[PDB]
Amino acid sequence: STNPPPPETSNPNKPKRQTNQLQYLLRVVLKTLWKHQFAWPFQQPVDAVKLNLPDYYKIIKTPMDMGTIKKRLENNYYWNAQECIQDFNTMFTNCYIYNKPGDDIVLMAEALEKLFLQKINELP
């Protein structure tokens, strides 16, 4: 029983810019979602061992969580705001892929996704 290593949070061989939008995604957008009531299943990588979901990292080929996004932002990992946005989109979409419509985690992810889209809409 072992979960795969979490996604990389630092990479030397990668284009890396430090912009105001990436700074905004960390200070405002991610901090808002982080303090939301539904944040707790997404702040860490999915623990398929404790949740008894042996098919997760086997159905989902590009896992993503807000904890990885956060460490990547704090490491100036992203090339621009769009690469970080793709991680948010990938995280929400992974939830919709693995789980069924109407499931508790899907309804939580849809509420966080709407708040995410409303925040990043007010972007420089």
Swiss-Prot record:
Changing residue 99 to A: Abolishes binding to acetylated histones. Ubiquitously expressed. The record marks 99 as: Acetylated histone binding. There is a cross-link at residue 58 (Glycyl lysine isopeptide (Lys-Gly) (interchain with G-Cter in SUMO2)). It comes from the Eukaryota. Phosphorylation by CK2 disrupt the intramolecular binding between the bromo domain 2 and the NPS region and promotes binding between the NPS and the BID regions, leading to activate the protein and promote binding to acetylated histones. In absence of phosphorylation, BRD4 does not localize to p53/TP53 target gene promoters, phosphorylation promoting recruitment to p53/TP53 target promoters. It is found in: Nucleus; Chromosome. The NET domain mediates interaction with a number of chromatin proteins involved in transcription regulation (NSD3, JMJD6, CHD4, GLTSCR1 and ATAD5). It is linked to Cornelia de Lange syndrome 6: A form of Cornelia de Lange syndrome, a clinically heterogeneous developmental disorder associated with malformations affecting multiple systems. It is characterized by facial dysmorphisms, abnormal hands and feet, growth delay, cognitive retardation, hirsutism, gastroesophageal dysfunction and cardiac, ophthalmologic and genitourinary anomalies. CDLS6 inheritance is autosomal dominant. Interacts with p53/TP53; the interaction is direct. Interacts (via CTD region) with CDK9 and CCNT1, acting as an associated component of P-TEFb complex. Interacts with RELA (when acetylated at 'Lys-310'). Interacts (via NET domain) with NSD3, CHD4, BICRA and ATAD5. The interaction with BICRA bridges BRD4 to the GBAF complex. Interacts (via NET domain) with JMJD6 (via JmjC and N-terminal domains); the interaction is stronger in presence of ssRNA and recruits JMJD6 on distal enhancers. Interacts with NSD3. Interacts with NIPBL. (Microbial infection) Interacts with bovine papillomavirus type 1 regulatory protein E2. This interactions may serve for the tethering of viral genomes to host mitotic chromosomes allowing successful partitioning of the viral genome during cell division. Belongs to the BET family. JQ1, a thieno-triazolo-1,4-diazepine derivative, and I-BET, a benzodiazepine derivative, have been tested on tumors with success. Treatment with GSK1210151A (I-BET151, a I-BET derivative) has strong effets on mixed lineage leukemia and promotes myeloid differentiation and leukemia stem-cell depletion. This is Bromodomain-containing protein 4. It comes from Homo sapiens. The chain holds residues 42 to 165 of 1362 of the full protein.
